[PDB]
Amino acid sequence: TLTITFDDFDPGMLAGPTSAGENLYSYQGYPQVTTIYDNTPEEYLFLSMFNTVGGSTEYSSGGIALSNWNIRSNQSGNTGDWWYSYLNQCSVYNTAVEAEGQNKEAGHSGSNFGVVYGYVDAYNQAWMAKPEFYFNVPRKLVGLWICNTSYTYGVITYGNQFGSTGVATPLKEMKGYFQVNLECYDVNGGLIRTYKRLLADYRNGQQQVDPITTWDYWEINAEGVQSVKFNFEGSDSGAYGLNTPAYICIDDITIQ
Ligand code: CNC
Ligand SMILES: [Ca+2]
């Protein structure tokens, strides 16, 4: 058995100066981290790269960032919904850990963890692609730990607005659900199996699921996985698809 803990990855890969992760984008003046991995590009255990969508390579195109952030509250100077905004996208929501900011030992392992962003639905499927990672060779994927991001936790709990018209509704109110999917692929890129996990559920007397507030184990036991994709499904979905921020944090991936 091995565990990918993220804690030993190159610091140069850590998301942006602040918890907005300004270096996850081409255009904000920082060396942009498109690619994370454990050792070198030559010999790695794990590797994710940002997708390219309409010729543009960005965290929004779907991918996985390395983070050591755990802010879940308006820091000095921030107001309104800031702590569950995209300007704190990189933060894990972890209530088991009193101090908040950068390397505050808030992973299921140390300070570090992956932040998954992206999803595909009927509205964006023509252009968008799912976040993905790879093993260097096919592996038994035993399981992994997960936790919500402050952004996702917040918007589930309170909703928000975004852009001119965008509305996200609290899931308690509209009897909503939100789910993450872990899709395992084989050595030839064949789908082995898709794994589902409810992050929240308040549907009709369905077992109610409240969002986790600390790291929670996800048993998989998939054989011969070369690569993994993530998607999100949820019922908070209008004219332009899913409104709930399509993010999850990941730590301590166990393999053999
Ligand atoms: C297309 C799209 C969409 N996006 Co963008 C995505 N992917 N997005 C984009 C693109 C914008 C379009 C463009 N430049 O041409 C694109 C790829 C740049 C983008 C970017 C972002 N987006 C992001 C997110 C998280 C989201 N996006 C959605 C709005 C998400 C949408 C899904 C949805 N249900 O809305 C979405 C699929 C459709 C928007 C649309 O046309 N609707 C029309 C409407 C919302 O108002 P509008 O004035 O016509 O639309 C504008 C804004 O919505 C704005 N916009 C788009 N995304 C966001 C996100 C935020 C936080 C804000 C404040 C504005 C935007 O772009 C639109 C065109 O100007 C989102 C609901 C998807 C999701 N379920 O995760 C979600 C917001 C969650 C929430 N409740 O707040 C990013 C933070 C992703 C990231 N990891 O970086 C990022 C923020 C900007 C950046 N730093 O690059
Ligand atoms: Ca870790």
Residue numbers in the entry: 49 to 304
Reproduce text from the manuscript describing this model.
The structure of BtuJ2 was determined using the same workflow as for BtuJ1. BtuJ2 crystals belong to space group P21212 and contain two molecules in the asymmetric unit. The structure was solved to 2.7 Å resolution, with reasonable crystallographic residuals and stereochemistry. The two copies in the asymmetric unit of BtuJ2 exhibit an RMSD of 0.127 Å across 211 equivalenced Cα atoms. There is considerable variation in β-strand length and loop structures compared with BtuJ1. When comparing BtuJ1 and BtuJ2, they exhibit a common core architecture (RMSD of 4.0 Å across 110 equivalent Cα atoms) but display significant differences in their loop regions. An interesting distinction is observed in BtuJ1, where Trp 78 is involved in interactions with the dimethylbenzimidazole group of cobalamin. In BtuJ2, this tryptophan is replaced by a pair of tyrosine residues, resulting in a modification of the interaction with the cobalamin side chain (d), which was sandwiched between the dimethylbenzimidazole group and Trp 78 in BtuJ1. Overall, while the shape, hydrophobicity and hydrogen bonding characteristics of the binding site are retained in both structures, the specific residues contributing to these interactions differ, reflecting subtle variations in binding mechanisms between BtuJ1 and BtuJ2. Interestingly, BtuJ2 was undetectable in cells but showed significant up-regulation in BEVs, highlighting its potential specialised role in vesicle-mediated cobamide transport.
In the human gut commensal Bacteroides thetaiotaomicron, cobamide uptake is mediated by multiple operons encoding outer membrane proteins, transporters and uncharacterised lipoproteins, some of which are incorporated into bacterial extracellular vesicles (BEVs). The previously uncharacterised BtuJ1 and BtuJ2 proteins share 23% amino acid sequence identity and belong to the IPR027828 protein family. BtuJ1 and BtuJ2 share a core jellyroll β-barrel structure, where the polypeptide chain forms eight β-strands organised into two four-stranded antiparallel β-sheets. In BtuJ1 and BtuJ2, the core structure is augmented by three additional antiparallel β-strands at the N-terminal end of the jellyroll and an α-helix located between strands D and E in the traditional jellyroll nomenclature (BIDG and CHEF).
